[PDB]
Design a protein around this ligand. Structure first.
Ligand SMILES: [Mg+2]
Ligand SMILES: [Mg+2]
Ligand SMILES: [Mg+2]
Ligand SMILES: [Mg+2]
Ligand SMILES: [Mg+2]
Ligand SMILES: [Mg+2]
Ligand SMILES: [Mg+2]
Length: 77
RNA sequence: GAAUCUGGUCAAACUUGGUCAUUUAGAGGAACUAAAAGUCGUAACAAGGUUUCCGUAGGUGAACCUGCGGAAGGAUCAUUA
């Protein structure tokens, strides 16, 4: 499990090993985009940032906790 | 009357530390300019769509905004109508 995907952009599937508000704090400044933590009931926790920066989202997910980079399959869309 | 030699004096330089100045590398940290077809907001110029700006304090992705006290560079020189 623990699958993660990015859909035009929301990130569905996020490990809980670090606090969410600091993730938002680093995200907004390193992307320069509006950031939302939307907690829909019992779906993959929603973190939404504007623009088409999936390469930059890759950079962020590498720089936050990511060390696998193999279960990430971003849908183009 | 030479070498030698006791004392001193001027005293170069050496040995060792201390001192600062001038250059010099130095991981990395931190900017600042030009670069104008990246990025996300649209802060400011009109009542900039919440009036602007200053000092001060806080929080915040940013341009900010909020509090307190100021000013007109205000959008009023004016209610003894
Ligand atoms: Mg002598
Ligand atoms: Mg530079
Ligand atoms: Mg944009
Ligand atoms: Mg505006
Ligand atoms: Mg304004
Ligand atoms: Mg308004
Ligand atoms: Mg002036």
């Amino acid at each position: 499990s623990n699958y993660i995907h990015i859909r035009i952009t929301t990130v569905q599937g996020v490990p809980e090993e670090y606090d969410l508000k600091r993730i938002l704090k680093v995200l907004k400044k390193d992307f320069a985009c509006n950031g939302n933590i939307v907690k829909d009931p019992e779906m993959g926790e929603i973190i939404q940032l504007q623009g088409d920066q999936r390469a930059k989202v890759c950079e962020f997910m590498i720089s936050q906790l990511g060390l696998q980079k193999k279960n990430i399959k971003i849908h183009g869309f």
